């Protein structure tokens, strides 16, 4: 009745009705107004958004968000908290309205805003992240579960959109996948999905294909491994055209050697050579004066220490979470004990002790190589099981140890 051709609509003075419908949680009426009417971008203003964030924002949700910040602070959560604080007191008003709708759990309104949003998939991933981190907070199970369900729904919607887009176009889809942030969250779609742990999005054929292509770099994909290895061992040969390329000899060789696959193979070969040199030096070394190969081993150990320092800087405290990184670092520091002991020409006991330190450190280096082999072979469906199983085993081992002591204690007394 009201919306008809006969009743001409100016579509300029409808702002108040839109505001009233928006606040009263009327999604269908909002969609009807957006069908033929104002522009959402033009209507939104700083004063209106501030009023929405201040007067009509429930205190319960604000307390929940404060608890989330205090307990589960995240890179996106701190930004959204800053935005909320600023508005409560490249503007991207649409993103702010979408976040406001999400926080109060207006499913239909959030859906409409997302449909009207310029950037959808990134916004969907960010909404999934925010809703999941809010669901982690548990003051009442009702909202904690509703937010998680909405996050899952948004995640699957984004998955469907991205797979359809990937089916549509290849290069443009890959380019969009890595689009830089426009101040929405400070990160792209891929990292945002990683932080929220979106298994469905990552477990997608297109993302896996893109990751494989990156893991090959500019070297031709599906060029077969044995050809790559033969070319790596015989450097001039790749110039002969044995290995194809995705799309100039210097460029060819630079691309071939910059491929992370070839880099990993070269690193493994160099590590094997270093271990062989370590074995040779172990049985051949002069206590009074070390020879050149010992100095070469020292230089290689210094390079490994530099790499370990780089890993520390890149990763942080989470680096030590894995027991094997801790073991590698401990062994690298342990080698320095033998280095120090070798510094003394006299005190033959100290010299022998340092030799023993080197001797024992060789074994742990071998174990590290064994671990890289095991991880490389089982990089498939089994991998998770492996790692999980691994940790379990260690606990039992630890348990066993804490029993032996007691037995030994008793044995001593006996």
């Amino acid at each position: 009745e009201i919306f008809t051709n006969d009743r001409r609509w100016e579509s300029a003075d409808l702002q108040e009705v839109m505001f009233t419908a928006l606040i009263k949680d009327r999604p269908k009426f909002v969609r009807l107004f957006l069908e033929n009417g104002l522009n959402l971008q033009k209507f939104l203003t700083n004063e209106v958004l501030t009023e929405l964030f201040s007067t009509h924002f429930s205190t319960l949700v604000y307390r929940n968000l404060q608890i989330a910040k205090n307990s589960y602070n995240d890179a996106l959560l701190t930004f959204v908290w800053k935005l909320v604080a600023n508005f409560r007191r490249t503007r991207h008003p649409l993103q702010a309205l979408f976040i406001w709708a999400i926080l109060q759990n207006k499913k239909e309104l959030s859906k409409v805003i997302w449909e009207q949003t310029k950037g959808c998939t990134l916004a969907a991933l960010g909404a999934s992240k925010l809703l999941k981190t809010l669901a982690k907070v548990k003051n009442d199970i009702n909202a904690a579960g509703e937010s998680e369900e909405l996050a899952n729904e948004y995640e699957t919607r984004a998955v469907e959109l991205f797979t359809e887009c990937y089916s549509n176009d290849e290069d443009l889809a890959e380019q969009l996948l890595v689009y830089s942030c426009e101040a929405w969250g400070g990160s792209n779609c891929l990292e945002l999905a990683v932080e929220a742990t979106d298994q469905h999005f990552i477990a997608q054929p297109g993302v896996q294909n893109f990751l494989s292509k990156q893991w090959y770099g500019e070297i031709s994909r599906d060029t077969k491994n044995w050809k790559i290895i033969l070319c790596l061992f015989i450097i001039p040969l790749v110039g002969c055209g044995l290995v194809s390329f995705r799309k100039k000899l210097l460029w060819y060789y630079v691309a071939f050697f910059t491929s992370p696959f070839v880099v990993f193979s070269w690193n493994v070969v160099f590590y094997i050579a270093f271990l062989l040199l370590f074995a040779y030096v172990l049985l051949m070394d002069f206590h009074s004066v070390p020879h050149t190969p010992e100095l070469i081993l020292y230089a290689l150990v210094f390079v490994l220490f530099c790499d370990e320092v780089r890993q520390w800087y890149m990763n942080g405290v989470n680096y030590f979470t894995d027991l094997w990184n801790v073991m590698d670092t401990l062994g690298l520091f342990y080698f320095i004990a033998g280095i120090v002991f070798r510094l003394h020409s006299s005190n033959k006991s100290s010299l022998y002790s340092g030799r023993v330190i080197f001797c024992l450190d060789y074994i742990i280096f071998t174990l590290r190589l064994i671990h890289i082999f095991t991880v490389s072979r089982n990089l498939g469906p089994k991998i998770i099981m492996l790692q999980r199983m691994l940790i379990d085993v260690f606990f039992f081992l630890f348990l066993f140890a804490v029993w032996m002591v007691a037995f030994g204690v008793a044995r001593q007394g006996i």
Binding site: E115, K118, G119, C120, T121, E160, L161, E164, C165, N168, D169, L172, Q175, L176, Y179, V194, T197, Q199, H200, I202, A203, V207, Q208, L211, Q214, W215, G217, F257, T258, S259, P260, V263, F264, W266, N267, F270, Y271, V303, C306, D307, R310, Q311, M314, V375, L379, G380, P381, K382, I383, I384, Q387
Partner: protein, 85 residues
Amino acid sequence: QENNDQVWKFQRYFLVQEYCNRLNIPFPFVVFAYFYMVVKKCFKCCNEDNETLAWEGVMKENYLVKINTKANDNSEEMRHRFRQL
């Protein structure tokens, strides 16, 4: 049983991306790169996007149309025709 397929793919993603993020210089000479970065760490310290976004919006519109028609096509009964009759 439902989520085994995606979990291992997620783990493969995490390991591959983590390794790729690291520098891809041959190990023996990797040190050189770091040294260079150190200089950059000390000496220095001391339209098309709109087109891509419009294309993505077009695909979003197509997906919305598809999901909307899916519900309509789901029903195997044409109650509108019966009401018209």
